[PDB]
Structures are given as C-alpha cells and as structure tokens.
C-alpha cells in the first residue's frame, strides 16, 4: 500500500503555511503515474508530491494518494488552523517506542517566550524560549489533552488543545 508522508511532518498547519505531501511507495516505477484524492474529489497534481503553497482554510481535510490498480492510501487528516499558538505534533496516533514530537508553533513563526506545555491540566514542561519536546520512546501514560501556553509580544496566549493517544502496538 502507498503511504503519505508530510514535509514538515505537522498535520496541523497555519493559514498561509507550506506543507508537501509525498506519496511514498514501494516499487513505484514512474513517479508521474499517480493521482491525488482530496476530500471527495480528485486533485490535478502529479509527480507524487503535492505542495500546498499559501494554504487557506479549504485545504484542510482528508488526503490520500493512489497509484495504479492498488487502491488509495490511508487518508491523513490535515487541519489548517489560524491562532496565535498552535500545538503541532508528528502524529496524534503514535505506537509504543515511536518518537513522539510536540512543538508550540507561534503565528507566522513568531518567537514565543515562556512556553509551558500542559498535559491534562498539569505542567509537563516549561522553558523561557520557544522549545520543542521530543520523547524518544512513547508510553501509554504519555497521552491526553496536550496544549501549550506562551507569550507572543509579551502577552499570554493559549493554543488549541490536542488529543494525543498512544496505543499498545502488537
């Protein structure tokens, strides 16, 4: 089956950011022989790399790619936001041992100070600058409603909450 990989791997972007979805596959032969299923309709992009330059609100939704007679890929959920702070993650569903990532992205990559990551109402971590948290191994207790609060231009704000679930991989 084909798979969709994002560059950058954040499935939540801003209104006006850039992300390229790549239809990564095995024994793909010619790269210009695939089609891009949007939410519902067909996109007209080619070369197995659909870029969303200056992304609007309508670019969010279901994304999948199809290569010849094998069916479409498992659809990734893009969600274009527009806020002062956005909590970006590598994946909402993360297996055991998979590397979990969280980043408190400011609006139009503004520098954010005093960023506090909260996991279900308690302070997971705090730093004076904009910082990521990169969990090398993921645990089932390392899940919940993650959200970050920071300071953009010396004013306190609040990111949209993110439901991250880590499940037991067989």
């Amino acid at each position: 089956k084909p798979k969709v990989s994002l560059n950058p791997p954040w499935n939540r972007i801003f209104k006006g950011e850039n992300v390229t979805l790549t239809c990564n596959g095995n024994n793909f032969f010619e790269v210009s022989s695939t089609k891009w299923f949007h939410n519902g309709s067909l996109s007209e992009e080619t070369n197995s790399s659909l870029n969303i330059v200056n992304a609007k609100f309508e670019d969010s939704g279901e994304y999948k790619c199809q290569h010849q007679q094998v069916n479409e890929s498992e659809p990734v959920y893009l969600e274009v936001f527009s806020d002062w702070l956005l909590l970006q993650a590598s994946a909402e569903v993360v297996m055991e041992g998979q590397p979990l990532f969280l980043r408190c992205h400011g609006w139009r990559n503004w520098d954010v100070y005093k960023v506090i990551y909260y996991k279900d109402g308690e302070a997971l971590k705090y730093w004076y600058e904009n910082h990521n948290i990169s969990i090398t191994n993921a645990t089932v207790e390392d899940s919940g409603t993650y959200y970050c609060t920071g300071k953009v231009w010396q004013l306190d704000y609040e990111s949209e909450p993110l439901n991250i679930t880590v499940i037991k991989a067989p």
Partner: protein, 316 residues
C-alpha cells in the same frame, strides 16, 4: 531659534547592572535666551519633585541649560516613559526616554468601556469606547467593526488615532448608544482586526446583570489642620451598591465642577455587600467663603427615582 532638546541617561555600573540612583539629564541648547519652564512627565503625569534646574549659560548668541531627575531602581525598571517638556514662548517641545529592550513590542490590546451612568442617565447620550493600545506604527491602522449580539445596526462611530509618546499608536472608536437599547440588555461588540494578526480581537459589553442596590452616600469635610488654612479637603464615601457602574460628581452653586478637581477611586468589593468608591476634592478659601454647599452626587442605575442620590456638605 527653536531649542534643541536631548536626554542623557545615567551610568550602567560597568559590569551589568543599574545604579540605584538613576539621573535623567535633559539638555536644552541653542535657543533664544529667556525664560524656559522644565516640566517632567511620567506617562503624561506632571510630578512635583526637587529637580535640579541648572543655571543658563550663554554661548555667543545662543544659550543652554539642563535639568536633572533622580529615580530609584524600581521606578526605572517598571518600564515607564519619562518626558522632558519645555514650555517656552507658549510652545511645547517634547523629548522622552524609557528603559529600552532589544526588540519586543507589547502587542495589540483592545479595551471596551461601558458608558458612564452620568452619560447614561443625566445627559441621556451614552457612548461606548473601544481603545486599541500598544499599536506599532508598522502600517495596519486596524479595521474597527461595530455590531450587536442580535445583529441590529448600530450608530455611526467616530474614530481617532493618537501617536503616543512611547513609540506606539492609540486608536479610539467612540460609538453613541441607544439608551433604551442599552438598558434593555443589548450586548455590543467591537472587533479589532489587523492584517498581521491571527483571529481578531473581539470585545463584548453589556449592562451588568445581578442584584441591584441603591448607593448610600455620605459626605464629610475637614476638621481643620495646623498650618495650611487656605484649602480644605472634602471626602465622599459612596458605598453598598450593585453593580459597579457609578459616576461621582461634585456640584457647587448648581454648577458641575471640572473632573480634574475630584479624585474618585475605582470601585472595590466590600465585605458581604456591594462596592464602595471614595471621592476627594480640595477647595480654596475663595470657594467655601460663600457658605454654599459642596454637594457630592452619585449617579447610579439603582438610585431610585431620579437615578441620582446627593449629599450636600459645607465647611463649618
């Protein structure tokens, strides 16, 4: 020739710190010689301190002098703006200073004001102010849209922009408000949108809901002080009222006094009751020599039946 006005700061200890006594030295030079009044400002407030106004030194056909302000570390590190203003020949030249960060604006803020009860009930033309502060001058000039909660149209709102002393802009939008529409409970909304921003600033105002209590007014005079004897300070306690929207006036000879005379504080929550405000006015000897009563008047929504309760006092 117009004067040239600069400000020199104090030392900075060499290593990394601020000295505990910070000297702000306003140099004025290259003016036509005469009388110059130095006024020092702290965010638009004139203070009365022992500023060291040096003598005027004449250099050729020009002249120069200086003034000095002293500060502690706390007031300088409180991130305030201090302005040396020369009141020379009926003209004002301004130069300001401030503790300077590297690059960090304070970010656009929006504040919505409920109408004063004096505007609501006495003048019967209430207005609502959306104040946009800490606006950088990097274009924008924020779009200011007015609406209600029920979608009804609003009156035409006037707008103004003032270039403040501390580098920023302050954009005021004043909207006249229907009185019957306001007292019935219509929620007004001010939307401040900037192009270089995410989701815009929405501010919502309404008539404050809850229990209502009539404001209890008491007024007191001064029982004399040794020395002084030329001025008296009257107080007015208005207490036990809900909600907190109260206008305090200080009438005399059935004539409204200017608001610069009184010093009415903000409402604060009492112990198991409503709010209290305190008013203080200074009369000269020429005002209470006519024996007429200084009448402290509270305008409030629950001050039945005239939306006004007043207490008149005079000095002895």
């Amino acid at each position: 020739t117009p004067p040239t006005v600069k400000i020199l700061q104090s030392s900075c200890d060499g290593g990394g710190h601020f000295p505990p006594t910070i000297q702000l030295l306003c140099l004025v030079s290259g003016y036509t010689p005469g009388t110059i009044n130095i006024t020092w400002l702290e965010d638009g407030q004139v203070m009365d301190v022992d500023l060291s106004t040096a003598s005027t030194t004449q250099e050729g056909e020009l002249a120069s002098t200086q003034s000095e302000l002293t500060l502690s570390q706390k007031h300088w590190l409180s991130d305030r703006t201090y302005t040396c203003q020369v009141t020379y020949q009926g003209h004002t030249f301004e130069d300001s200073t401030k503790k300077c960060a590297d690059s960090n604006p304070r970010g656009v803020s929006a504040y919505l004001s409920r109408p004063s009860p004096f505007d609501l009930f006495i003048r019967k033309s209430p207005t609502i102010t959306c104040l946009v502060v800490d606006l950088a001058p990097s274009k924008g000039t924020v779009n200011l849209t007015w609406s209600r909660a029920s979608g009804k149209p609003v009156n035409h709102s006037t707008r103004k922009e003032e270039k403040q002393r501390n580098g920023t802009l302050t954009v005021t939008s004043t909207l006249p408000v229907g009185t019957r529409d306001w007292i019935e409970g219509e929620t007004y909304q001010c939307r401040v949108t900037h192009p270089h921003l995410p989701r815009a600033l929405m501010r919502s105002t309404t008539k404050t809901s809850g229990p209502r209590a009539a404001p209890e007014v008491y007024a007191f005079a001064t029982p004399e002080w040794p020395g002084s004897r030329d001025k008296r300070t009257l107080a007015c306690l208005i207490q036990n009222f809900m909600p907190e929207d109260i206008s305090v006036q200080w009438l005399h000879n059935e004539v409204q006094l200017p608001d610069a005379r009184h010093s009415t504080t903000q409402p604060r929550k009492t112990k198991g009751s409503g709010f209290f405000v305190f008013s203080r006015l200074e009369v000269t000897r020429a005002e209470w020599e006519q024996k007429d009563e200084f009448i402290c008047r509270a305008v409030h929504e629950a001050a039945s039946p005239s939306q006004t309760v007043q207490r008149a006092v005079s000095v002895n």
